[PDB]
Amino acid sequence: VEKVFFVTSPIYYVNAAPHIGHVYSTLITDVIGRYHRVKGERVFALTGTDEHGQKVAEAAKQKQVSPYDFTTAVAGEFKKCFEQMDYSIDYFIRTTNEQHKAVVKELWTKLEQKGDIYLGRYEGWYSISDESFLTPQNITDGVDGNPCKVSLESGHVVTWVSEENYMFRLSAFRERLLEWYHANPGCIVPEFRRREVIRAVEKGLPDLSVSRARATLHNWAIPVPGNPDHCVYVWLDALTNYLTGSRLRVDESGKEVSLVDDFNELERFPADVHVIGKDILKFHAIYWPAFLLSAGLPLPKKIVAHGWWTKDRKKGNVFDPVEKAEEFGYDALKYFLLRESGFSDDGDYSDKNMIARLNGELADTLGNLVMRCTSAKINVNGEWPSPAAYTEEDESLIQLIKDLPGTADHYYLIPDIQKAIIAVFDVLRAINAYVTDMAPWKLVKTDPERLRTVLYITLEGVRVTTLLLSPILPRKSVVIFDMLGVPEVHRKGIENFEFGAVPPGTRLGPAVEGEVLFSKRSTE
Numbered sequence: 001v002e003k004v005f006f007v008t009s010p011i012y013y014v015n016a017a018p019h020i021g022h023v024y025s026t027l028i029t030d031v032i033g034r035y036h037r038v039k040g041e042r043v044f045a046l047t048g049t050d051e052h053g054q055k056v057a058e059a060a061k062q063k064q065v066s067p068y069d070f071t072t073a074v075a076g077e078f079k080k081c082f083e084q085m086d087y088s089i090d091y092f093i094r095t096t097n098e099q100h101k102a103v104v105k106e107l108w109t110k111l112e113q114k115g116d117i118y119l120g121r122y123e124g125w126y127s128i129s130d131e132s133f134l135t136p137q138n139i140t141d142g143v144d145g146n147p148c149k150v151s152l153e154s155g156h157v158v159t160w161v162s163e164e165n166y167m168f169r170l171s172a173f174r175e176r177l178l179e180w181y182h183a184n185p186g187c188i189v190p191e192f193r194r195r196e197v198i199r200a201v202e203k204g205l206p207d208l209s210v211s212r213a214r215a216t217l218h219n220w221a222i223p224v225p226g227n228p229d230h231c232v233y234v235w236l237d238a239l240t241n242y243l244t245g246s247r248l249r250v251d252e253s254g255k256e257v258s259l260v261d262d263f264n265e266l267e268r269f270p271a272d273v274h275v276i277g278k279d280i281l282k283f284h285a286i287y288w289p290a291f292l293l294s295a296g297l298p299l300p301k302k303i304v305a306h307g308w309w310t311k312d313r314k315k316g317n318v319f320d321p322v323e324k325a326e327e328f329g330y331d332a333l334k335y336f337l338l339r340e341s342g343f344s345d346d347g348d349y350s351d352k353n354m355i356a357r358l359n360g361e362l363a364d365t366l367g368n369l370v371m372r373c374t375s376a377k378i379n380v381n382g383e384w385p386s387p388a389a390y391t392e393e394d395e396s397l398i399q400l401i402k403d404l405p406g407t408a409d410h411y412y413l414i415p416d417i418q419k420a421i422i423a424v425f426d427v428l429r430a431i432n433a434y435v436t437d438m439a440p441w442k443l444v445k446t447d448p449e450r451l452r453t454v455l456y457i458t459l460e461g462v463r464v465t466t467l468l469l470s471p472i473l474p475r476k477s478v479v480i481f482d483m484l485g486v487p488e489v490h491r492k493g494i495e496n497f498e499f500g501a502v503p504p505g506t507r508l509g510p511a512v513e514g515e516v517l518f519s520k521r522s523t524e
């Protein structure tokens with residue numbers, strides 16, 4: 001059924017400035033979003049900041065500033081960061097928003113009315129930096145430089161907690177979560193993280209503390225309805241951002257104008273894809289579903305958990321994203337982060353490797369190809385020629401180009417953006433090979449009729465590969481299409497995934513004396 005494609009990033013704690021990693025998480029959200037928009041679908045990509053809680057309040061206290069002023073200042077830093085990265089996110093949500101607060105209270109009330117929240121105690125370990133309850137099996141010894149306990153997850157300092165808290169009956173949802181994981185084998189990606197979650201829930205689930213004593217949080221939280229002494233767990237608050245996002249009417253400015261009663265009215269909920277980091281799996285794959293199940297809400301379709309940490313600066317080389325983007329280009333940096341990093345994440349992010357892939361792939365494979373097929377030397381009429389008869393070699397390359405969109409489509413749907421990039425560049429490599437074999441520079445004179453067929457296939461290969469690379473290189477793809485002189489209408493739509501969609505006779509865009517699409521960086 002047609003609904004709005006809803007893709008989300010996590011909302012980041014605002015205890016410290018934005019850094020790489022927030023950027024990576026949001027980039028993944030932005031690319032998935034962008035790709036569905038080139039497919040012609042309706043999209044709503046969501047991002048933002050997690051502003052309540054003990055972690056954030058104690059960061060604000062440690063800088064001698066009011067939480068109100070602090071959450072706002074850092075929230076601003078994130079927005080500026082994401083503006084300057086040239087994303088295309090539809091809305092930036094803050095948990096301090098008053099409509100957000102309303103949704104949390106509605107969601108809470110439903111959980112309670114369902115008979116799934118009881119007054120209890122939590123006596124156990126807690127990681128303030130992760131806002132995470134941990135069992136004794138998940139802690140160990142470590143340093144402050146004093147002897148203390150630390151979380152096995154993150155290595156952050158853990159503390160004992162003994163509070164009367166409101167408890168959520170998570171243990172009641174073990175069997176339904178297990179049905180869900182199995183009946184929908186694609187709900188968690190990558191597959192090995194799906195197996196991790198299933199093992200965790202198979203071992204058993206305790207109930208979860210969903211409130212905290214107000215003293216503990218420095219009164220920087222959403223109050224529990226019907227009990228001002230308590231505050232809603234920062235994570236239940238935080239996870240509710242997705243439901244709140246799905247219910248906000250937003251204007252062209254990006255300001256929210258209205259909170260609708262029923263999520264169905266905007267056709268966004270539930271999320272089609274939640275992009276998260278490996279460090280926040282349990283909240284999304286265990287807790288969030290259980291809350292949704294309790295309240296009677298539809299579950300998300302997919303949670304993709306990438307190989308990075310969502311939130312530790314220390315981690316993995318020192319790497320400012322805006323500084324790099326000015327050093328290497330924004331599109332190029334995004335390409336590199338997406339190409340280099342898989343799910344297990346064994347990535348080499350050195351300037352050596354960054355230069356290798358820029359020079360090698362972007363310049364020599366893609367850049368090269370675009371200049372060859374638009375050169376006054378080769379393309380003397382500066383147009384899309386009409387092709388003659390196709391040789392078997394021609395047809396071998398045409399087939400690859402024809403098959404590319406189906407293959408790239410599947411990868412983006414996984415989603416595995418790395419694999420989709422590899423698939424497109426595999427075709428780009430083939431096109432270069434074809435072009436070397438055919439030596440069109442010689443054909444201009446030898447055989448003009450042959451050059452037409454070869455030039456046409458090259459142009460159409462370059463077009464289609466660029467369409468599929470457009471969620472990754474949004475600014476450069478526009479330049480490419482301008483050089484090829486592709487009409488705007490043909491720059492999106494599944495219709496334009498088809499080989500031959502730009503007709504012969506189309507005129508190439510005008511050249512400039514100085515322009516180069518990707519400039520090779522100093523050899524070091």
Ligand code: MET
Pocket residue numbers: 009010011012013050238239240241280310311
């Ligand atoms: C609902 S996603 C919340 C993520 C968490 N606040 C973090 O920054 O890691």
